Amino acid sequence: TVRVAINGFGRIGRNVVRALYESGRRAEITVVAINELADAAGMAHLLKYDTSHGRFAWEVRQERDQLFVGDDAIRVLHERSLQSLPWRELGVDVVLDCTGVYGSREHGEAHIAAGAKKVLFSHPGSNDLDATVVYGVNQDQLRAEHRIVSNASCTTNCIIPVIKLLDDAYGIESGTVTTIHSAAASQSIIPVDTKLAAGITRFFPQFNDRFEAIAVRVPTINVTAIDLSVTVKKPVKANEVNLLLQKAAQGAFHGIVDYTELPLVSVDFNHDPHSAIVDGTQTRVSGAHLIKTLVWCDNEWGFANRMLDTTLAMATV
Amino acid sequence: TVRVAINGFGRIGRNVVRALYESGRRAEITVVAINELADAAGMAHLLKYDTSHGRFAWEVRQERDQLFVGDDAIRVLHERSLQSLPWRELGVDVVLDCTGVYGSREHGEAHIAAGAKKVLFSHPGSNDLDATVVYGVNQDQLRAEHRIVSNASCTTNCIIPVIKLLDDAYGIESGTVTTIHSAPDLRRTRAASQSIIPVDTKLAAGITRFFPQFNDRFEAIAVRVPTINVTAIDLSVTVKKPVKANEVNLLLQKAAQGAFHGIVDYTELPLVSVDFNHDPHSAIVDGTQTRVSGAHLIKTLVWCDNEWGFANRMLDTTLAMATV
Amino acid sequence: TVRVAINGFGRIGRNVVRALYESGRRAEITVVAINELADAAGMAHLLKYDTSHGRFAWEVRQERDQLFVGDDAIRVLHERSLQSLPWRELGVDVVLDCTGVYGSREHGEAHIAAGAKKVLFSHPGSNDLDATVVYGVNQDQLRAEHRIVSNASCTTNCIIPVIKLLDDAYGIESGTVTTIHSADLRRTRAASQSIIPVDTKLAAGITRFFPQFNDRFEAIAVRVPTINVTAIDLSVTVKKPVKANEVNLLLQKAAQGAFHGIVDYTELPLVSVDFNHDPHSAIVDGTQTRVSGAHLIKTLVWCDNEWGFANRMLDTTLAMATVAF
Amino acid sequence: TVRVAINGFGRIGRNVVRALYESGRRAEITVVAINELADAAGMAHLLKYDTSHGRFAWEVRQERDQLFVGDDAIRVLHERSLQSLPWRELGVDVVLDCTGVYGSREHGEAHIAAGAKKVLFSHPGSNDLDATVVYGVNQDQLRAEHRIVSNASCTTNCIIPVIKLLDDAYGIESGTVTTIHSAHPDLRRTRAASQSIIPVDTKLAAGITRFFPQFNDRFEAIAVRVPTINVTAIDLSVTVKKPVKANEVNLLLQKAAQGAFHGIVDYTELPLVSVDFNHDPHSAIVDGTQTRVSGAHLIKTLVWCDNEWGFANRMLDTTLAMATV
Ligand SMILES: *CC(=O)c1ccc[n+]([C@@H]2O[C@H](COP(=O)(O)OP(=O)(O)OC[C@H]3O[C@@H](n4cnc5c(N)ncnc54)[C@H](O)[C@@H]3O)[C@@H](O)[C@H]2O)c1
Ligand SMILES: *CC(=O)c1ccc[n+]([C@@H]2O[C@H](COP(=O)(O)OP(=O)(O)OC[C@H]3O[C@@H](n4cnc5c(N)ncnc54)[C@H](O)[C@@H]3O)[C@@H](O)[C@H]2O)c1
Structure with a gap:
């Protein structure tokens, strides 16, 4: 033992x-x-x-x-x-x-x-x-x-795997993140301090002066949503990105990253062991180079x- | 009358x-x-x-x-x-x-x-x-x-002015938006009060319609959270002209005093969503939340009473x- | 089968x-x-x-x-x-x-x-x-x-057992109930931030099950924006004089005996969500039991509705x- | 000035x-x-x-x-x-x-x-x-x-006027209160306020007996905190000597609200929710639609106040x- x-x-x-x-x-x-x-x-x-x-x-x-x-x-x-x-x-x-x-x-x-x-x-x-x-x-x-x-941290542990997967596959040029934290507080959306970018650039030093982050606290229970936006070199389509991530969830990142296309809400990921669950239905690409992905995690x-x-x-x- | x-x-x-x-x-x-x-x-x-x-x-x-x-x-x-x-x-x-x-x-x-x-x-x-x-x-x-x-719509009426101001000043190349709303699809048959609920957003369609130059250059998602009355819009845009966070803030702040007085407001005060309850502005920009990644990726958070x-x-x- | x-x-x-x-x-x-x-x-x-x-x-x-x-x-x-x-x-x-x-x-x-x-x-x-x-x-x-x-109903199923236990032991003379439910120009409005009065079929349900209580029981109810668990605030007048802890002891005994698996009793410092997914019809919160004079009993009962x-x-x-x- | x-x-x-x-x-x-x-x-x-x-x-x-x-x-x-x-x-x-x-x-x-x-x-x-x-x-x-x-206190200031009105008119024998509050000592205190109903300490039982010494050992109180905004609900239950009906009680209170207690107590029969009393200057607003009488002697009244x-x-x-x- x-x-x-x-x-x-x-x-x-x-x-x-x-x-x-x-x-x-x-x-x-x-x-x-x-x-x-x-x-x-x-x-x-x-x-x-x-x-x-x-x-x-x-x-x-x-x-x-x-x-x-x-x-x-x-x-x-x-x-x-x-x-x-x-x-x-x-x-x-x-x-x-x-x-x-x-x-x-x-x-x-x-x-x-x-x-x-x-x-x-x-x-x-x-x-x-x-x-x-x-x-x-x-x-x-x-x-x-x-x-x-x-x-x-729980947030860096949540988003870093995704950032890696995306960077490896398409070459991230720059990135911006919004974190929607769960918990007067019980009525508002509250803007709060966030260390998540410091955490990303530290883990990926190639992204100094290329990543920023904001965060808000809302009166929900337990589960956190991370709204990641990145610019990439390689041109991409929403479903290609989804296919990449889905494959990762079934392969190299099994048990760490999960992927879902089901119509779920935050609480459904309550008590989910994965570091990150990618919501396929929320993946978007603007032009061919700006990727938005929403990732859930039990923080x-x-x-x-x-x-x-x-x-x-x-x-x- | x-x-x-x-x-x-x-x-x-x-x-x-x-x-x-x-x-x-x-x-x-x-x-x-x-x-x-x-x-x-x-x-x-x-x-x-x-x-x-x-x-x-x-x-x-x-x-x-x-x-x-x-x-x-x-x-x-x-x-x-x-x-x-x-x-x-x-x-x-x-x-x-x-x-x-x-x-x-x-x-x-x-x-x-x-x-x-x-x-x-x-x-x-x-x-x-x-x-x-x-x-x-x-x-x-x-x-x-x-x-x-x-x-x-209220969301388009909220973010369009900001998108214009930013486009005019820096030339927007592409954009992505997240809307955080306050309080068929199987997500609709379940409790509001504890969950972040993805919802359908037509904000994308509204922006590209108003700005046709942005077809296949804008996307949008949205979520509903159990807060009261006020909506937050999290806008991310790539621009041509290189920029810094405070330059962007200075632009928007000037607009709030000037051309967009009474329609767009700007603030650097430490406030929360409910503080914009009953605010007549179409949009209030939260300066403290403005970011620029590299010199070209702008994040701005805009509040509005929806x-x-x-x-x-x-x-x-x-x-x-x-x-x- | x-x-x-x-x-x-x-x-x-x-x-x-x-x-x-x-x-x-x-x-x-x-x-x-x-x-x-x-x-x-x-x-x-x-x-x-x-x-x-x-x-x-x-x-x-x-x-x-x-x-x-x-x-x-x-x-x-x-x-x-x-x-x-x-x-x-x-x-x-x-x-x-x-x-x-x-x-x-x-x-x-x-x-x-x-x-x-x-x-x-x-x-x-x-x-x-x-x-x-x-x-x-x-x-x-x-x-x-x-x-x-x-x-x-779930509410009647929750409170009836307690009303029986109390009536058998002390003889209930009259009763009044307040139900705090989790989540008419009131339904037409925002449930995320309000205590909302709502109509209740509980007084009906009690007097039906215990006909000896016609014109002796009333009920109100409110809806609050909590999750899943319901609180029932029961107040009864009784014949036999009683003290708070006697009442608690009675109920605690019932929970270990005749009403095992149906009624539970607790003195732990808990909140509603702790009774989420609890199979008991009713959980009595001992810490909230009160007696006014020797004859007016207040008891708060939780249930997963x-x-x-x-x-x-x-x-x-x-x-x-x-x-x- | x-x-x-x-x-x-x-x-x-x-x-x-x-x-x-x-x-x-x-x-x-x-x-x-x-x-x-x-x-x-x-x-x-x-x-x-x-x-x-x-x-x-x-x-x-x-x-x-x-x-x-x-x-x-x-x-x-x-x-x-x-x-x-x-x-x-x-x-x-x-x-x-x-x-x-x-x-x-x-x-x-x-x-x-x-x-x-x-x-x-x-x-x-x-x-x-x-x-x-x-x-x-x-x-x-x-x-x-x-x-x-x-x-x-705000809660005593809310409920005392009602208790007086009721006592004067029907002679209160004993009482019990539940207060529904909006948002080391307890183990309940440091738990997520967003979603549970939360039992807490209350000194209303005292505040009342202090103001009305004739009620020592005749009043008790409990309270809970729920995740609503600003407005507080007080659920008052009293035994009285004089026999009464729900609408008589309501009529008494309504009369008080225009008369002797104008500006301090209000009365309403409209279908409202807690937030409707937000920013209300009255010490107490009585919700007529929630008044009940069990038997002829147990009165339940729900009173709102902006705490x-x-x-x-x-x-x-x-x-x-x-x-x-
Ligand atoms: C923020 C914002 O602008 C936004 C976001 C999403 C959707 N909308 C649009 O807002 C409009 C209506 O909103 P509202 O909440 O006022 O509607 P309601 O749910 O309160 O109901 C409308 C009201 O009218 C009645 N009604 C229906 N049909 C009627 C006819 N023919 N004549 C008279 N009254 C009628 C209905 O019963 C209710 O009383 C929408 O445009 C929505 O897309 C805005
Ligand atoms: C039910 C009811 O009537 C009710 C509701 C809420 C509170 N009370 C009672 O009123 C007293 C004050 O409580 P409150 O919650 O208003 O106080 P606070 O937490 O908002 O802050 C107090 C305020 O005083 C300042 N302060 C502390 N120490 C000071 C000294 N020595 N000198 C000058 N100012 C001082 C502090 O920084 C803060 O700004 C309570 O008794 C409560 O029971 C009643």
């Missing part, structure tokens, strides 16, 4: 746990410890009841400083700073840090120092890390040497499963 | 009336008749109360074939055919048809035959009508021979029609 | 099917035919994708005149009137009529005439059917000679097909 | 200002100072644009140490402590404290010490206070001596009474 600890039991941490069990990737990975400065029972409870994904199918309990998913007893810690984490004592192979506060080399080193073999951050974190993984695209680029890695669940995918790769290399 | 009749007292019809009074444009134009298939009080009530806005500031009464807004009398009719409309009897200068059912030439002729000097449709309709007016862009192209005219803006344009166009 | 046909594949009909499979009651019941005046391709699609309940876990297919949940084939019919239904040909033991249009005796007789042994309506029907079953309360009064029966009811349809169906002489 | 300063420019503070100008109580009250921790420009923005009330009709300019509503020049302070407030310098007749933090009479004394003649809190207060005015019910009990007074606007106007009403008495 690969044994992981989770630092920070927020939304993403909780989902990683839920995902571990539902995906059955329990067989290959046991969570041994969770750490959040937050009261233990608020965790057990919040793990059991989730606003988007239903009651957790497994039986959850929290007595003492011990969380319980099914028959597993997860030791619950309340450390405030990285050094005093008993990673060594627990034999932690990978620490998934989902705190959202920690993210630099030093934080990584601190985790390793505390006894963890490797670290995986649930966000981009400081630039200079031993690696950055958008699973399904560049997991093959992982080494032994690589011990402090970032898993990108938490997809990412959560990628955390686990990346973890496995890290522990295996 | 120009006298108008309203055919169809739906959402848009009601707003046109509300707009007439609130805009203060009651001094130039008067509503003499409304023709509806619903009950009469049905109308008075819905005119007084609506969920998009607030209680109508004016006092709304209702008696049988009548309707009262303030001191003004408005003959309420219930005719299922245009032939039998007493437009002649009432001296109607313009009929604003907001039924959403009528829209070809013949329907226009029918209204005129019934005694109306001119007709204005609250939508695109079929192609061959005298002119489609996107007020603030091409109202100067109204001759008096134009008797049956279309007011475009009913109020359009409702005021109906009145603006009406005036223009009655004045030429 | 008990073999059922479903007349009307609307919201409730679809859920009955989903419920049959998810609850494993499919070992004991078979849906052999569905009839709806709707596009059969659309039937399959709507069965697979639901706004409340998510993607149906089973594999759904449609082709010509067959729907396919899993490896099962259901005959899809399109008859516009009750007379021409091939119930006899298919050996239907019970017809679950979830059309919401049909509900008289005659409609029942028509179904039986068409070849169905018994009929179960997904609503309270007219006033004089053979039985109304609020399962868990009076299913023991089903005899084998009741062939046209009503399953009450569709799922609970759907599973009760199946429960009642079984009882009807089983009830021996 | 009467001069007022506003301590705390939150939701309520902002609305008081908006109300002053819109209601037309501007020919009777002037705001001279707003003391607030955030910058003069933040203040001005939020005053102009509101999530729940639209664009403020007046022109909101900003300059120097001044806000401007029309040609009226209001002054902005950022005094962190209470003693350093220049109330004396500005000749403040009443301080409306809408901070929600201050509410003890020491706080009151502090304001007065700083130079304010009288103080009015936008909530119940931490108490041992001079008075508690639910305007339209007991403003006549104000005395030149009461210098530190509380304006109750901010009504209250804000009452703040102004109470202020006037205080400065006048």
